[model samples]
Target: MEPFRIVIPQADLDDLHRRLDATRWPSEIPGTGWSRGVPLDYLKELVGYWRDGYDWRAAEDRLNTVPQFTTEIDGTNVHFMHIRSAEPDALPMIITHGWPGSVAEFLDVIDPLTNPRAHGGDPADAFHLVIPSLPGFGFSGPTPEPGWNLPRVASAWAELMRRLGYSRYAVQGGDLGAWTSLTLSGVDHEHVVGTHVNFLITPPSGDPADLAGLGEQDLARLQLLAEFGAEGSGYMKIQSTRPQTLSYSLTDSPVGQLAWVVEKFMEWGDTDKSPEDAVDRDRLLTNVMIYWLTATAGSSAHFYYEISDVLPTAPTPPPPAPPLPTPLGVAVYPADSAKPVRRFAERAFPNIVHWAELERGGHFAALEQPGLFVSDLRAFARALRTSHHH
Candidate 1:
């Protein structure tokens, strides 16, 4: 492993500014708002700020607070932040980021997680965190080849934990990260003590009985999910089928890239507010900056394409297999597009030891609600510990 630092050259920043300045914006239908897509007015304002107002240096400096390192795992360079807690008995844990999310997403929770006492929690809750940027995303650089699917990434994470000399650890993530964490638990069950995820993809079994016990809120979430599959999954469809074609436009145009990612942030966040209101505007741009700076827009999209077959949203969902043996914890946020019902999740993760239906937050739980996310994770850890002792 080698120490790594993010240092985007001035030339690249200049090129981005030039492109932003020269963007040939498309005309939008008047008064339609976000129903069609990102409103032209909103995107134009964001683009103007991205080019002139947002400070990349400040964002970089904030991220540099966490010590980062990169190492070769499975022929791909994996970039990760290794933050060790002062507590000697701190549990080792690996946190993974999903697409359009870099290590940046976990910045808010790192201090609270690694040094709980410093953040007004018991020191016993401390964790030695390993936050990795998924291959072909952010500082991990691009995947050198195809076939870098979720299971492949999970295997790579198992190898990573082994390489770090961690005999026992925990796993956590959301979105693609959640998928990776689940897969890692299955592949590395002997070493992974517990697993926690904010996003659990639970497709309905189509049985009328399954919906019988659901509360009004859960029923509303199901309705939201149905609407998502119908009207909101265009991005997934395009990415899963023709990422290469989409890549050309996103990789070339900063505005296209920003709209593509920002739209998800807006759509998947709290329905009542804008993306900036749900998340810090500067941080949102910083997340976008990582994609633009790394030029991984194309490579990151490949994840959807490669894993299209096994995706929960796939036309033919995978058959119900036996529940995974590893203890699982799930936190369902209200505004997230896919909210997993406890019963549905129990079918796949029968060993679920902790479940929290949060009041707010969205698909990007850690980013949108870091305090709640951290608290739920610590609760899961405590529950897992108690269960294991019994």
Candidate 2:
């Protein structure tokens, strides 16, 4: 184990500026808006700000405010931020970030979560937060090996918690991070007392009877899935099947990389036209910078290709499986990739102790709606505390 600080050489920042300046932008048909992808005009403005006004140094300082370290887990460097709370009895928790999301996703969340009393909550609700970059993402860098897939990452997290001397802790995440947490909950059920997940993905499955007795609102969720299956899966298909072929463009051109990731933020977040509508503009750029600076866009996409082979498919059985020993909590945001019905989610996660249908937010709940994320996490932990006593 060793301490780590992110120190990007001034030369790399200069190269990024040169690339941004020398961008040979593509021409989009007029008035197409986002129909044809990231609108040419919109990206031009964002890139202009990125080239001249946005401060990478400021982002670095913000990240360094949290204590960070790197440890070799499974023969690869795993970088993580460990923010301990001042509260004496704060519960230990390891939070994970998803693809296109670096450890920065939780910056707005850390202070409030680690010191709930400072944020107008009881000190008893505080947590000692541990946020790790997924193995092939951000400061963790391009994974050296091919098999750094789902179970491998989960086992690494289990080993991480043990190294930190945390015998009991909680896990929380969204997107790929959610899958990692779910995997860890099962892999380390004895130590993981509770699991909290924001992205409750229950893809379409079973027969028409799956809809029988389902609420009108729940039916709307299936409609969204149907729409996504019809139109929105091109990105997933490519990332899952032929990521390296696409990586040629993504790694070479900053513009290509920006458009690729920005499109998801536009469509997935609660925003109308641009991700900036739902998330902070600079923060969105910071996320983009993580992939750009680390040059891990290709490596991170391999996770999609790998996990697609493992995650349960459309024929998921209708009956609830035997409950996982760890208590589960799910927070569903309307604009998430898949809005899981309570009945359907219960089928997979039978030990669900708390569930909430949030009115706002999207796939990036911790970034899009940090307050609600913190509230839901605290509420879930409170439930576990009560259940643990009884």
Candidate 3:
């Protein structure tokens, strides 16, 4: 492992402030809600917090509280935060952050999951966390070469576990991270203890029972999901079809970066609640800053290309035999592109032991509802320990 630590020279932060202060405002007509776009008012408020109130030093220090390092795998440098639990026997867990997320996903939940005692829980439930920024995202930066797709990312994860000297561990993710976690479970079922996921994938298959049971509203939601997949994934669509074409826009314009990311942070998250009520704007933009600084603007979204399956309607490979030695756990948030009916899920992942249908939370469950997400994951991991996941 190579040495890696959180260090942002003051120059970088200052440059960020300058760019933010110089932003050219987009004009909006009078009194329109989301019909226009991200409300400029809310953005101004968020920008204010980012410019004047938000403390990057405090956040940077807290991030450094956990040990982080880099390791070479398949010729690419993988960056990760390795927060070891004081308890030697603590379970090894990898919390994979998705597309718009970074190692920042577990920022709030790290201590609680690692030392639940501090959060008023049992010490036995602690974890040795290995949280990685997915390839081409955040600190991991854009890949210098190819083959960093879904399965490859999974392969790197298994290697990361071994590098940490963990024989068995649990994995959890939201959005793209969820798929990567599933890919890891399928690729290395013998090593991964179990799987926990937030994003219910939107592949075409649907359970007949679920279809029959879909309420009028749920059915409408299904239609919206389809339409959204068509038009809403403009960023992903370009990333998948022609990644290099979109790189210039992302690399050159901070406002462009904000528009792309903030759109998802708004449309995909629980906007019914104020964003401030759900997640910090500075943390959100810090994520954008990762893309801004690293210039991974296009490649980070290239997982769409790596993952051959785009539409749920696309043909899928048969369920792998011995159905993922890792037991599966699911926390399905309402805002996910699709919901998995147990029957469909069981066909693919047979050892599912935990499932939660959360009333609130969006694609980014880790950031949206950290406490609830971690609690469910802890219980699921505890249950998996007694079984032969490997």
**Candidate with best TM-score:** 1
Model 3, 223-314: lDDT tens digits are: 76676766676666567767777777777667777766777777777766455455667778667667776677777877666664543323
For residues 45-139, write the lDDT of model 1, one tens digit per residue: 98888888999998999899899989999899999999999788988999988877888998999999999998998887889999999998989
Over 4 Å off in model 3, which ranges?
Answer: 29-32, 202-210, 213-221, 308-325, 386-390
In candidate 2, stretches whose alpha carbon ends up further than 4 angstroms from where it belongs are 311-322
Question: What's each prediction's TM-score?
Answer: 0.97, 0.95, 0.88
2 or 3, which is superior by TM-score?
Answer: 2
Clash counts per candidate, in order, are: 0, 0, 3
Between candidates 1 and 3, name the one with more favorable TM-score. Answer: 1
lDDT of each: 0.88, 0.85, 0.75
Q: How much is 293 displaced in model 1, in angstroms?
A: 0.6
Note the residue pairs that clash in candidate 2.
none
Best-to-worst TM-score order: 1, 2, 3
| lDDT tens per residue, model 2, 219-250 | 88878777787787777777777878978889
Error of 2 at 288 (Å): 0.7
